[PDB]
Write a protein that binds this ligand. Structure first.
Ligand SMILES: Nc1nc2c(ncn2[C@@H]2O[C@H](COP(=O)(O)OP(=O)(O)OP(=O)(O)O)[C@@H](O)[C@H]2O)c(=O)[nH]1
Ligand SMILES: Nc1nc2c(ncn2[C@@H]2O[C@H](COP(=O)(O)OP(=O)(O)OP(=O)(O)O)[C@@H](O)[C@H]2O)c(=O)[nH]1
Ligand SMILES: Nc1nc2c(ncn2[C@@H]2O[C@H](COP(=O)(O)OP(=O)(O)O)[C@@H](O)[C@H]2O)c(=O)[nH]1
Ligand SMILES: [Mg+2]
Ligand SMILES: [Mg+2]
Lengths: 426, 63, 430, 438
């Protein structure tokens, strides 16, 4: 009745999607074989959102997994939950990307899109009423930033009256994994701004900081990192799958969080991230839950809200709770933070409540909020773009593939126009 | 085992000895075994049922 | 499935591949007979209906003194009868013989074998080349191969591993002529070229492995370890994968600059390996030490431009990032102002495999660095100081002028690489 | 809801609270695991354990105590021993290097690197408490951590919390014997801070308690576990009025008013009765009359001083168990009849009494007998003026030729602090004879 089509691109998208389809399989009670093994009856009233029905009572994800290299598809199907992904839903090329935006968007990504548009048109026309789309990828790579942004342009012009959400992995100065990643970031962000509705910037210093001082883990493997971002992604769309007192889907979240079409950059956060030895010793209550949420420690972007001003803030709640304690705490945090919120718009906080918490917990929350402080992420990319483009470093990998310097010249100018637009509303 | 000597966050190691020492050298390393993630994270009591307690179903019972 | 073709030219190339392919055999468990005793080897080994894994390599040399031992020894059955091309007469330390007269007779056969191996692969990644500048075959026939390969195959990746003549000691006298004359082709017909130095490997083996008196096999073990650590990503699963088209783009900023340096860590013996605590920071700061470099040049004088790091074993990205932050903190390592984010990192699960009778210890984690540095202009200048001295009195030039080439090619090969040095200093200007 | 916060500073403070919190668990029936026994679990609306334990929704009872020290060799066995699953993993704070009998290290150099974390812990425990009554602080005078850090702590709690009650339990460098050499310096330098920032401070001597354990309990070689049973018994007797019902209830802000006549005199003495063995309690009679005069005996006082030489100012009596108010009032007038016990003419009525219903509890492997009633004495006496003088006789002889002073002045303090800490006690001492003038 309201289906969500899931798009995974790149190596980073493949590992996040493997974790994401593991968590909501645990939430909906789906074994690695594909048969429902659960006890309650409310898990099947809304199961068609992510799972298509097949013979023998088997449920399969409505997701497509793409990458230019076949080296990561073998690891996807060799995972714990690699036996439920459809073999048709794997689209792979035979040549790499080389962390190049030009290779993945113009030369090698030109012929791999027509296969995946055929697959996604087959999937999208098979549902009764599609709620929207969803993509996770990485801007620091060649495939997710290159071919994924091609899928942004093609889908947005083929299905116009649909909602587009992206969980983008923004790059880092200190976790700089690629030499040429400022090129692959600016050329991805420029195509991303005009052709989406909701963006969620996930960055890796925040996940490394959370796994160090908040969870007290000594070996924060990517499986530990991906479980945090997958919990947020499952926490966004809880109202579509489970009932509650005040339901709010992705469209209702996007209306109240996006005042202007070029202001669509959020900055996520989660709730109870307590260490294993400290779980027994704390009282898990609503004021203790919302104390952690507004702090900058558990927040999943490498930006400080104290250096900026909030515009809109949303919180999605789970589990049985008193509505008065939600309204009193949101009013209290709005009154005490009279300087951290803008004054030209009242009631910047939105709330939503579901009744089903995740497994092993009793109530959780998800923080979705945009801020002016997200410009600190874009100022450091633009200044390192300008410092390197002036001496034409690594240019022959781009201008030798059919690209032109004018596309480089406009990309910085549109990105400078975006960071100039964020400043006026502070 | 792990965390015998009393330095470098020995409490969390001693509390989670029973959850991170399942392997018996058949596999290379802890990172190689937990490449998919640690078994107990963000919760405990790993086998716990879904509640069927809807607010409407609790409030409106047969009188 | 993604595979590459390895080509070994000259006596240095065949004796490097001779020790590299046995490490490739031991990494995948291939016995020297050529069969599995009981698909990650598809990058190097070709399947057969009888279960034989035939390597996809090319060996070429103009003399049979070295390849007949390959035709004789334990790896006789494993290697193909026609993947080992031998000539009739050696080039004998001359560029003109290897590039104009002797090298033209076997190049068609070599290209036929290359096409016969290239028709097998559904997807090809690139060509790795192993040769030495000082030898006549590795100077001339390599240049002919690099000229004739780019015409036949357009945009295939071309990686090189060069045995450079050392600035102090060498095994010939006329090798500056060959070193100048091969750059005039390999500057424009090559995507990337890594550099090694025999006396640097000598110093590393004498100071770290405690073997004060090494051998060519002892050097080739470390060289093959470098190549295995480079190509482990196409074979073994890991958290992050790199390709032959990845670090080429991440390390070549300009088409005229494709010369990085290679470094390995940890290099330690089995006797003292059990005492030192081998940590991620303690193995990644040894790569930045100038005394651990594999080329006799000091990076303190020069400036880094890009760096690529490859990790093998029980490595976690958190310690890697905490060590990159520490190595960015210090002033002793200097970076140019136009590359603020210069690091590439890749992670592989499999720890390195040791060889029976080998020198290296069995370690849990290893790291390899390929770093582009401006300090190779010093290495070019120290050989210019020899080339001018040799060419002033016009010594050893009569064989060159009588074997077919024109004397003006000497002046052209000096002038273009002088312009290349000017380009290096222009890039090095802040 | 009437709750108090207990903090244990120094090696002596955390060792007392190790043996004091096990007495709290057995009085309220809490297992060392941290939960009530399942055989007798029931819901009855009890708030007696709330004074010391915070309820968690899983049935776990977390104590509201903070353990702070600078060396890990005293905290880690609390973290390893039987009560490892009872204490909060972050309520107990360890340092890196000890103060090592240095007031300058515990107040200026090392103690300032932990004080921000400690007040953060105090703030978080205070945010949970709906209604707070006061702070109970446990330390010893002689040690560097117990002299410097609790002085730094006490001057930081007063600027944060304005008018909260501060109750202090201090262990004193014994007059004849000592486990340290420089501890006369640390005892002088800790009390110029606790004179002005402490509402009340109680007094415990190690060498005196040895004699009660040797004669009454008949333990010829006592150990630290034996001494801490008596120390934890007094605090349990003091705080019994908040937890348990009784005829007369005394609040933490009540006996502070009744025992502090002047702002410079806030040093009472503690006495417990009846302390007795299990064998000779069978022979003896232990009614109200013979337990209320045993606390008046100079040999049963836990501070080595003579009340015969001194003068009583105010007394507070706390009774537990099968005690009726009739014979207590009859026993008080018997005490006032005796001429050996002398009172100030400025205080005609110096007694305050309190009755509680629940008798004291014992511990397995304990030394005290299972008795029916007990009385705890909190008396303010002028006789402490001899106890300052006998340590001032040690201070001036040590300071005659500047022994051990170069490491105090090497950490960052000024040599004039010793002179200031001597003159104010000389002024403090003369305040005691001036109020002692009839
Ligand atoms: N590191 C290393 N270097 C080698 C090895 N074998 C040869 N070399 C180098 O090769 C140089 C000698 O030139 P060769 O490779 O033998 O000559 P060639 O390429 O066969 O050319 P011709 O002999 O004229 O046919 C020496 O200076 C060595 O530095 C080896 O096993 N390891
Ligand atoms: N009554 C009693 N006193 C104790 C006990 N443990 C230690 N003490 C006292 O503590 C003194 C020893 O110095 P401490 O106060 O413990 O030294 P500290 O607090 O650790 O200070 P630093 O050593 O600098 O860290 C002795 O004189 C004892 O009187 C105990 O269990 N019972
Ligand atoms: N948080 C997280 N980040 C990842 C994961 N896998 C890869 N990445 C990030 O993805 C970036 C590399 O992207 P890349 O693989 O080159 O993208 P692709 O070429 O499109 O496949 C690095 O900066 C990594 O930090 C993961 O499992 N979790
Ligand atoms: Mg030869
Ligand atoms: Mg101590």
């Amino acid at each position: 009745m309201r289906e969500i089509v899931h798009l995974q691109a790149g190596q980073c998208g493949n590992q996040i999607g493997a974790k994401f389809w593991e968590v909501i399989s645990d939430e909906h009670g789906i074994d690695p074989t594909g048969t429902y093994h659960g006890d309650s009856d409310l898990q099947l009233e809304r199961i068609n959102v992510y799972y298509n029905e097949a013979t023998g009572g088997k449920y399969v994800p409505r997701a497509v997994l793409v990458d230019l290299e076949p080296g990561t598809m073998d690891s996807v199907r060799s995972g714990p939950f690699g036996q439920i992904f459809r073999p048709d839903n794997f689209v792979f090329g035979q040549s790499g990307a080389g962390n190049n935006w030009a290779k993945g968007h113009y030369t090698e990504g030109a012929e791999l899109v027509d296969s995946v548009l055929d697959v996604v048109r087959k999937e999208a026309e098979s549902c009764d009423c599609l709620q929207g789309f969803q993509l996770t990828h990485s801007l620091g790579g060649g495939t997710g930033s290159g071919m994924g942004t091609l899928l942004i342009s093609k889908i947005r012009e083929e299905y116009p009256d649909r909602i587009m959400n992206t969980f983008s992995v923004v790059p880092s100065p200190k976790v700089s994994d690629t030499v040429v990643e400022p090129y692959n970031a600016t050329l991805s962000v420029h195509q991303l701004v005009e052709n989406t509705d909701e963006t969620y910037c996930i960055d890796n210093e925040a996940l490394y900081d959370i796994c160090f001082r908040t969870l007290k883990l000594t070996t924060p493997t990517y499986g530990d990192l991906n479980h945090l971002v997958s919990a947020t992604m499952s926490g966004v769309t809880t109202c579509l799958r489970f009932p509650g007192q005040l339901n709010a889907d992705l469209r209702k979240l996007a209306v109240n969080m996006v005042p202007f079409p070029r202001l669509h950059f959020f900055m996520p956060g989660f709730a109870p991230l307590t260490s294993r030895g400290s779980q027994q010793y704390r009282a898990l209550t609503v004021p203790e839950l919302t104390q952690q949420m507004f702090d900058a420690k558990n927040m999943m972007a490498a930006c400080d809200p104290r250096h900026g001003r909030y515009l809109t803030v949303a919180a999605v709640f789970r589990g049985r709770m008193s509505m008065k304690e939600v309204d009193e705490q949101m009013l209290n945090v709005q009154n005490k933070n009279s300087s951290y919120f803008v004054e030209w718009i009242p009631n910047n906080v939105k709330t939503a409540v579901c009744d089903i918490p995740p497994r092993g917990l009793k109530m959780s929350a998800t923080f979705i909020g945009n801020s002016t402080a997200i410009q600190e992420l874009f100022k450091r990319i633009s200044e390192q773009f300008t410092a390197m483009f002036r001496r034409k470093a690594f240019l022959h990998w781009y201008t030798g593939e059919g690209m032109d310097e004018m596309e480089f010249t406009e990309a910085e100018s549109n990105m400078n126009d975006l960071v100039s637009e964020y400043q006026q509303y502070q | 085992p792990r965390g015998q000597c009393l330095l470098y966050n020995w409490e969390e190691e001693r509390a989670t000895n029973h959850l991170d020492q399942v392997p018996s050298m058949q596999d290379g390393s802890e990172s190689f075994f937990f490449r998919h993630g640690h078994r107990g994270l963000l919760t405990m009591q790993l086998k716990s049922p879904m509640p069927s307690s809807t607010t409407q179903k609790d409030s409106y019972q047969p009188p | 499935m993604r595979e590459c073709i390895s080509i070994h030219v000259g006596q240095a190339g065949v004796q490097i591949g001779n020790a590299c392919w046995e490490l490739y055999c031991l990494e995948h468990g291939i016995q020297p007979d050529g069969q599995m005793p009981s698909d990650s080897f598809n990058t190097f080994f070709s399947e057969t209906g009888a279960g034989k894994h035939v390597p996809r390599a090319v060996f070429v040399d103009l003399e049979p003194t070295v390849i007949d031992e390959v035709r004789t020894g334990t790896y006789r059955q494993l290697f193909h009868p026609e993947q080992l091309i031998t000539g009739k007469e050696d080039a004998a330390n001359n560029y003109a013989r290897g590039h104009y007269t002797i090298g033209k007779e076997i190049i068609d056969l070599v290209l036929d074998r290359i096409r016969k191996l290239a028709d097998q692969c559904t997807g090809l990644q690139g060509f790795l080349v192993f040769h030495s500048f000082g030898g006549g075959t590795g100077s001339g026939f390599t240049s002919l191969l690099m000229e004739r390969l780019s015409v036949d195959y357009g945009k295939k990746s071309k990686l090189e591993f060069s045995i450079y003549p050392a600035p102090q000691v060498s095994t010939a006298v006329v090798e500056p002529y060959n070193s100048i004359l091969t750059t005039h082709t390999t500057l424009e017909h090559s995507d990337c070229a890594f550099m090694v130095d025999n006396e640097a490997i000598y110093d590393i083996c004498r100071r770290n492995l405690d073997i004060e008196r090494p051998t060519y096999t002892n050097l080739n073990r470390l060289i093959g370890q470098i190549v295995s650590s480079i190509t482990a990503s196409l074979r073994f699963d890991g958290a992050l994968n790199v390709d032959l088209t990845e670090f080429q783009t991440n390390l070549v900023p300009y088409p005229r600059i494709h010369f990085p340096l290679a470094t390995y860590a940890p290099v330690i013996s089995a006797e003292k390996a059990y005492h030192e605590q081998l940590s991620v920071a303690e193995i990644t700061n040894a790569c930045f030490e100038p005394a651990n470099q594999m080329v006799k040049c000091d990076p303190r004088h020069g400036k880094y431009m890009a760096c690529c790091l490859l990790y093998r074993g029980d490595v976690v990205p958190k310690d890697v990032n905490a060590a990159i932050a520490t190595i960015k903190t210090k002033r002793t390592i200097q970076f140019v102002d136009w590359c603020p984010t210069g690091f590439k990192v890749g992670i592989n699960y499999q720890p390195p495999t040791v060889v029976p009778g080998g020198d290296l210890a069995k370690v849990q984690r290893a790291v390899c660095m390929l770093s582009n540095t401006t300090a190779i202009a010093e290495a070019w200048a120290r050989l210019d100081h020899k080339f001018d001295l040799m060419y002033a009195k016009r010594a050893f030039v009569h064989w060159y002028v009588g074997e077919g080439m024109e004397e003006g090619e000497f002046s052209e090969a000096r002038e273009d690489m002088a312009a290349l040095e000017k380009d290096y200093e222009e890039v090095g200007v802040d």
